[PDB]
């Protein structure tokens, strides 16, 4: 019953591969629905064509700023930034999908994929999904990042949507 969504990743415009996600709608329905709807584009805006603007190897890949492309933008499907739904799920290792934010109850569209256990984020960022297939593609993405997060190649979501 939990939705599955996919991202088709490109690097400087060349296809890299697909990464799918299980979205934990049974535990965090409002947060999972936000990400699902942005991935299908069914509200008229969303992730398709956006970039991963901050990649720090051994740490995480951050994306979802489809409005300013640099970490300062993005917006939810709810017309404003929304609340931290709960912190039931923890940052337990690589593949965890979590919401970026600018402090309590400031969720928009930005998210990150963990590439290591990041337990210091527990209780600060809402975990809402996990990579299902294509962890190897996130590992290939990670190699284009750097210590300060700048990417050495443009990493874009060439296509995205809902699976099954």
From Swiss-Prot:
Molecular function, one GO term: cyclosporin A binding
Keyword Isomerase: yes
Effect seen on changing residue 120 to A: 200-fold decrease of sensitivity to CsA. Reduced ability to stimulate MAPK/ERK phosphorylation
Residues with the N6-acetyllysine modification: 27, 43, 75, 81, 124, 130, 132
Recorded catalytic activity of this chain's protein: [protein]-peptidylproline (omega=180) = [protein]-peptidylproline (omega=0)
Sugar-modified residues: 107
Cross-link (Glycyl lysine isopeptide (Lys-Gly) (interchain with G-Cter in ubiquitin)): 27
Modified residues (N-acetylvaline): 1
Major localisation: cytoplasm
PROSITE patterns (UniProt xref): CSA_PPIASE_1 (PS00170), CSA_PPIASE_2 (PS50072)
Effect on the protein upon substituting residue 69 to A: No effect on peptidyl-prolyl cis-trans isomerase activity. Reduced interaction with BSG/CD147 and ability to induce leukocyte chemotaxis
Subcellular location, record wording: Cytoplasm; Secreted; Nucleus
A GO CC annotation given for this chain: cytosol
EC number(s) stated in the UniProt entry for this protein: 5.2.1.8
One of the GO biological process terms: positive regulation of MAPK cascade
CDD domains: cyclophilin_ABH_like
Keyword Secreted: yes
Record's signal peptide: none
Membership in a protein family: Belongs to the cyclophilin-type PPIase family. PPIase A subfamily.
Oligomer status and interactors: Interacts with protein phosphatase PPP3CA/calcineurin A. Interacts with PRPF19 isoform 2 (via N-terminus). Interacts with isoform 2 of BSG/CD147. Interacts with FOXO1; the interaction promotes FOXO1 dephosphorylation, nuclear accumulation and transcriptional activity. Interacts with integrin ITGA2B:ITGB3; the interaction is ROS and peptidyl-prolyl cis-trans isomerase (PPIase) activity-dependent and is increased in the presence of thrombin. Interacts with MAP3K5.
Protein name (Swiss-Prot/TrEMBL): Peptidyl-prolyl cis-trans isomerase A
Organism of this sequence: Homo sapiens (Human)
Gene designation: PPIA
